Each structure stands twice: as structure tokens, then as C-alpha cells.
Design a protein around this nucleic acid. Structure first.
Ligand SMILES: Nc1ncnc2c1ncn2[C@@H]1O[C@H](COP(=O)(O)O)[C@@H](O)[C@H]1O
Length: 638
DNA sequence: GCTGATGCGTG
DNA sequence: GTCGGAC
DNA sequence: GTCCGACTACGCATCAGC
């Protein structure tokens, strides 16, 4: 009945009864829209998971086929990552498409969306013959349609579909379609919560029951200590099957048929399906390394400054390569799929490798900085056109000749790789390693890593919790790098010359800042980076306040920002701020120290973060562009 | 055909 | 990528 | 400690306007 009252938060929820659509029907969008409201209006993850599980339990019950689209809509994805589907819609399009469904001038709506920090708000509030209600599988279909449109005049074909949806919207549905398209759904619930909410709902209301189903609450006969243990157990089955097959188009099918408990029997890590890779927790010292890893024996590997390349060789010759995000990078490495046989021993018949592809200068036999690695062509590439040579630095092995080494320790996997593959210096090399426990030979290896052009030390255990089982701990490796050590690495004192407006969590004060570095010769300040991270909320207000005085109507004439985003508020140069950063880069758009190191290009910071306010310094006292040039030169340049 | 704006995926 | 915050 | 969402530089790919 009236979907505008659907409350899946309501206590003692019943899949069939407090639904707001009768069985075998399509699930309505305002179902999802209402649910989303019930989620964004709480803050306890555990409560938010329940509200989704509910909507999910119903869907499992009355409308099985709609399930998969609901998860996706709730994840705000479009499909499996390897499909590389993308909306190609941006704020420009969407804002426009909004104005076009409502009337206001783009330049009026445009300011409301910046003043509110949320597009979805503006679409709804703006106020003919009403069309049929929207369905959830319907909106998912239109979203995919928009993704698929390409080539000239495709934006315009997109703005229609969008104008379409917005015009079949009822109550809140505007709010959430806008937000989905803008990439920023911001509910407070994401993958993990969606995953946990699914595993619950199919445990409370198991799938494949003939309607009307026997057990809508398979939980009702448990004790609270028993339920909370039961769900959590079922949770991990789902979680780890996903971490090996992070693809809902494969799972949700089998789930619906064989239920949760036997899902690991049909959904197994197989070469060709890309799995989630092992993340790295930051470790700000070496004290901290032995606090975390007090007992266990660990290895030490260089941290290469390439990108992650997940290499699949499947029984059947064919190679596929995937990125950190399960994106299909096969097209962009024809110089890898070729060199492929030259690393697998001949008795190696199917494998999965966890490596980092780094840029290699052949004519010099030395590394090339990340910036160069990124100048390779993407998408599809023919093998002749290649220009930036890449050399892999393999540091794990996850599958070999049939077996799935997830369950084996690192020490098991290391020898298994070391002994099955072949080093080629300039193509294929094991991460330079040094097993130890020795503080003095660690920092001797730390400084060494960098000396050899790397960000620092990877640090992982060898036997104790040494698996590749992402589901237990996902940041179980440790990343140890120079700029984390309070009192090391490059910190500069810089000038706040403008500020940017916030989005979402920072809606209603400044979300970013523009930072500048006194050039001496030109008696000009010069934009060097933006900065939107590393302050607390309390500091970030002290900011938006003590800067609410300095506000300018126009630039000062001695400030030169060039091709940086024009700040939304310009500022009278007073505040001086100390910034830490992991590197300095040759900026294709920043003015600071342009000329001193390159004909055209300035210099920016890599991973800028704010450390503290430098009151005792005055703007002519901050770091000079002559200074800035110096740090870039003293930075493993060869 | 080009160019500027900008989406999106690496980090 | 870095980072804080709420639970 | 986990999970989520603020924010960042760099560059290839793409398409509206011209
Ligand atoms: N020896 C290594 N071990 C682990 N990760 C590495 C190694 N070399 C490079 N990486 C990259 O470092 C990333 C982790 O860095 P971030 O996380 O702090 C991984 O996703 C890899 O892409």
C-alpha cells in the first residue's frame, strides 16, 4: 500500500506484513528511498545494518529477482568492477539536468548546490501530469543506460534519462537519485555494512522458500548471545567468499539457490576472477613495529612506487591483469602478457601474482618516478607504441597450478614464488627483502630503501597471522614510510591565500585551502597546492572563523595562482601554516618555482597534510620558492 | 579537426 | 593516497 | 579498531563548442 509510510526501521519488523508492495511485483524505488532515509537519520552502524537487512529480507521474500539491483543501488555501483562501467555524468551535466527539469537558471541552482553542499537537496526542494511510480530495477536500468551512452551528442542523451527520472520522482526519490548520480550517496553505510546486512537478511529469511514462506524470522528461537554469535559466523562466510569473488553478479545467483552456508563450495577463488588484495596499516615508527609484532618473525620489503598489478595466468595460456580495484588492466600491458612465459617455470601451469609494476629506464637501468609510470597509455594499447618500460616487483603469490594459497602463511608463499619464477633484472625481480628483528639493521635498511628510490618499508609477518585471508584483518601488513615519523621528512611553512567551500561533512564551512610560497625575486606569493586534510573539526572551525575576518572581494595583485581552481573565498594573506608532505612533484598547473627547475612547470606537494598553525611566522617569513626548488632537487634525481 | 573543461582511476 | 570521527 | 566519508596531485580519455 502507501509506500510513503514504509518504515523498515519499525520494531519487530516482519518481511511480508510491513512491506509496502505485494509479492511478485517490482520493488518500488520509494521503498529504497524510504529505507535510505531511515539509514541516514541514525548514526549507529548496527542500527543502519538492521534497517537494510529488513528491506533486504522483504526483497528476498516477495521479489527475489529485484535482489541484485537493490544491492547495487544500495552500494551505488553499477555492476562488477572488472566491467569498468562508469556514469560519465558529472556535476555540470547533473546540475544542468536539474535546472532542465525544474526551471531555474543553471547559475542560480549552481549556487544553491554550493551553499548547501548537496545536490540532492536542490533537486527535490525545487517545486503537471504525474507518471507511474518508479521501480528499483527500473532506476537501476536507467542508471546503466546512462553509463552505456558514448560519443558525440551523448551528454544530451544522458540529460534526458536524468530529466526523465527526476520527473517520475515522489517525495524523497529526487534527493537520492541526484545523490547516486553525483557519486556522493553519503548514507554512512557502505560495502561492509551492505555485506553484513545481506548475510543477516538471508539468515533471518532464507531464500528459496515457497511463498508464503515458512520462516520469516529464523532468528526468533535463539538466545541473544546465540543470535549475535550465529549472524557473526554467517557474516564471515559471506565476507571471505566475497574477498575472493568480489562480484555480486556471480554470488547473488548462487546465494539464492544454495543458501549461504554452502556458498564457499561453488564460489571459489579462480584465476580470471580478480580478488580483493591485502591492504597495509600505517606504522609511524619502529617502536610501533615491535608493539604490533612483538613476538612474531617478520620480513622487510622495499615499498615500490609503482602501481599494483594483479597478474592472472590461467590453465589455458591466456593472461589477464587486474588493478588494486579489480579493474581490468589487461589492455594496457601488452609488454607483460608477451613477457609472460619468461617468469613462470615450465612446470608452472596456472598462477596468480601480487606485484607492483614500476617504471624502468632501460638506457640507464634505474627506476622512474610514479609521475612517469602514469604517462603510459591506458585502455587499449598496441605493443609497438609502448614508451615507458615497466618492470614488475613480485611480492606475493596467491594461486599456483590449481591450489589456492590463501590459507597458507607468507613463508609458505614466499618460497613457492621464489622457487617457481625467474628473476630478470630490468623486467622481473623479487621485492628486495631482509628478514630480521634488529633495530640497528632495520633503520639501516629503511634509509637504504629510500636511497634505492622507494617510499620505505613494507613489513609483514612470516607465520603468525601470515595468511592472505583479507576477511579477518584487511590492513594486516604494515606500511612504514619516512614522512610518518614525527620530526622527519619535508615540512614547509606556507601561506593561506584563499579557501574553498565544503561538501557533505564539511558543508557550511571551508572544505579546502589554497597554499602559497613566497617568491623573493618576483615579490609574489605563488600557489603550490590545495589542502583539505589533517586538521580536526575543532581546528577546522578555528580556521573558518579567524579567516572569516580576512575575507577578500578580489585577489591581492601580488598573488599568482595560475591554473588552480579560483578559490570561492579569496583571503588577505595573513595565516601561515606548516604542511607535511610525502614528496614534491613537477606540477603541470602550479606556479610555485616555475622556471627554477623546469621551462614551463611549477612544483606541487604530494599528499599535502596540515600539521599546525605557525603564528610566530609572518607571510614574508614562510618557505620561499627558491627553498621549494631545493627540496625537489635533493630528492633521488638521476 | 582542434581545445578547453572535466570525468575517472591510479596513487 | 592522508586523515579524523562516531560508534 | 572498524567503517565511512571529508580532502589531495597527476594525467589519460573523452566530448561540447567552436
Ligand atoms: N613489497 C610490497 N608489498 C606490499 N605492497 C607494495 C609493495 N610494493 C609496492 N606496494 C604497493 O603498496 C600499496 C600499499 O600502500 P598504501 O596502502 O600505504 C599496495 O597496494 C601496492 O600497490
Amino acid at each position: 500500500l502507501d509506500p510513503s509510510g514504509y518504515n523498515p526501521a519499525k520494531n519487530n519488523y516482519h518481511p511480508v506484513e510491513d512491506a509496502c508492495w505485494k509479492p511478485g511485483q517490482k520493488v518500488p524505488y520509494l521503498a529504497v528511498a524510504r529505507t535510505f532515509e531511515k539509514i541516514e537519520e541514525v548514526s549507529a552502524r548496527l542500527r543502519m545494518v538492521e534497517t537494510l537487512s529488513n528491506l533486504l529480507r522483504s526483497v528476498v521474500a516477495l521479489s527475489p529477482p529485484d535482489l541484485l539491483p537493490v544491492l547495487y543501488l544500495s552500494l551505488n555501483h553499477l555492476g562488477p568492477p572488472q566491467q569498468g562501467l562508469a556514469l560519465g555524468v558529472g556535476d555540470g551535466v547533473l546540475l544542468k539536468a536539474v535546472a532542465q527539469a525544474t526551471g531555474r537558471q543553471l547559475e542560480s541552482v549552481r549556487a544553491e548546490a554550493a551553499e548547501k553542499g548537496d545536490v540532492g537537496l536542490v533537486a527535490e526542494n525545487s517545486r503537471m501530469l504525474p507518471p507511474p511510480p518508479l521501480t528499483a530495477s527500473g532506476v537501476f536500468s536507467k542508471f546503466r543506460d546512462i553509463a552505456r551512452l558514448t560519443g558525440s551528442a551523448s551528454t544530451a542523451k544522458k540529460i534526458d534519462i536524468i530529466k526523465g527520472l527526476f520527473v517520475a520522482c515522489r517525495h524523497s526519490e529526487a534527493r537520492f537519485i541526484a545523490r547516486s548520480l553525483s557519486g556522493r550517496l553519503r548514507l554512512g553505510l557502505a560495502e561492509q555494512s551492505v555485506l553484513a546486512a545481506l548475510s543477516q537478511a538471508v539468515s533471518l529469511t532464507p531464500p528459496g522458500q515457497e511463498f508464503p514462506p515458512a520462516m520469516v524470522d529464523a532468528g526468533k528461537g535463539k538466545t541473544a548471545e546465540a543470535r549475535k554469535t550465529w549472524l557473526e559466523e554467517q557474516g564471515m562466510i559471506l565476507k571471505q567468499t566475497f574477498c575472493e569473488v568480489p562480484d555480486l553478479d556471480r554470488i547473488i545467483p548462487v546465494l539464492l539457490e544454495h543458501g549461504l552456508e554452502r556458498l564457499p563450495e561453488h564460489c571459489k577463488l579462480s584465476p580470471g576472477i580478480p580478488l580483493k588484495p591485502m591492504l597495509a596499516h600505517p606504522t609511524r615508527g619502529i617502536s610501533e613495529v615491535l608493539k604490533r609484532f612483538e613476538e612474531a618473525a617478520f620480513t622487510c620489503e622495499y615499498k615500490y612506487d609503482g602501481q599494483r598489478a594483479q597478474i592472472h595466468a590461467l590453465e589455458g595460456g591466456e593472461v589477464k591483469i587486474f588493478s588494486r580495484n579489480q579493474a581490468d588492466n589487461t589492455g594496457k600491458y601488452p609488454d607483460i602478457i608477451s613477457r609472460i612465459p619468461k617468469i613462470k617455470l615450465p612446470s608452472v601451469t596456472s598462477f596468480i601474482l601480487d606485484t607492483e609494476a614500476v617504471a624502468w629506464d632501460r638506457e640507464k637501468k634505474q627506476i622512474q618516478p610514479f609521475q612517469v609510470l602514469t604517462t603510459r597509455k591506458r585502455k587499449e594499447v598496441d605493443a609497438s607504441e609502448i614508451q615507458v618500460q615497466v618492470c614488475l616487483y613480485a611480492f606475493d603469490l596467491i594461486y599456483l597450478n590449481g591450489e589456492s594459497l590463501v590459507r597458507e602463511p607468507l613463508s609458505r608463499r614466499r618460497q613457492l614464488l621464489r622457487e617457481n619464477f625467474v628473476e630478470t633484472e630490468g623486467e622481473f625481480v623479487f621485492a628486495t627483502s631482509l628478514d630480521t628483528k634488529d633495530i640497528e639493521q632495520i633503520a639501516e635498511f629503511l634509509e637504504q630503501s629510500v636511497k634505492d628510490s622507494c617510499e620505505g618499508l613494507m613489513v609483514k609477518t612470516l607465520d603468525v597471522d601470515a595468511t592472505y585471508e583479507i576477511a579477518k584483518r584487511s590492513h594486516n601488513w604494515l606500511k612504514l614510510k619516512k614522512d610518518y615519523l614525527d620530526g622527519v621528512g619535508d615540512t614547509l611553512d606556507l601561506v593561506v591565500i584563499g579557501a574553498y567551500l565544503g561538501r557533505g561533512k564539511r558543508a557550511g564551512r571551508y572544505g579546502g585551502f589554497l597554499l602559497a610560497s613566497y617568491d623573493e625575486d618576483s615579490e609574489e606569493l605563488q600557489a603550490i597546492c590545495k589542502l583539505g586534510t589533517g586538521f580536526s573539526d575543532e581546528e577546522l572551525e578555528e580556521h573558518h572563523q579567524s579567516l572569516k575576518a580576512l575575507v577578500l572581494p578580489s585577489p591581492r595583485p601580488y598573488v599568482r595562482i595560475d591554473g588552480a581552481v579560483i578559490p570561492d573565498h579569496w583571503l588577505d594573506p595573513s595565516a601561515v601554516w606548516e604542511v607535511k608532505c610525502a614528496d614534491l612533484s613537477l606540477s603541470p598547473i602550479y606556479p610555485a618555482a616555475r622556471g627554477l627547475v623546469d621551462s614551463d612547470k611549477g612544483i606541487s606537494l604530494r599528499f599535502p597534510r596540515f600539521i599546525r598553525v605557525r603564528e610566530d611566522k609572518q607571510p614574508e617569513q614562510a618557505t620561499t620558492s627558491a627553498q621549494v626548488a631545493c627540496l625537489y632537487r635533493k630528492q633521488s634525481q638521476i
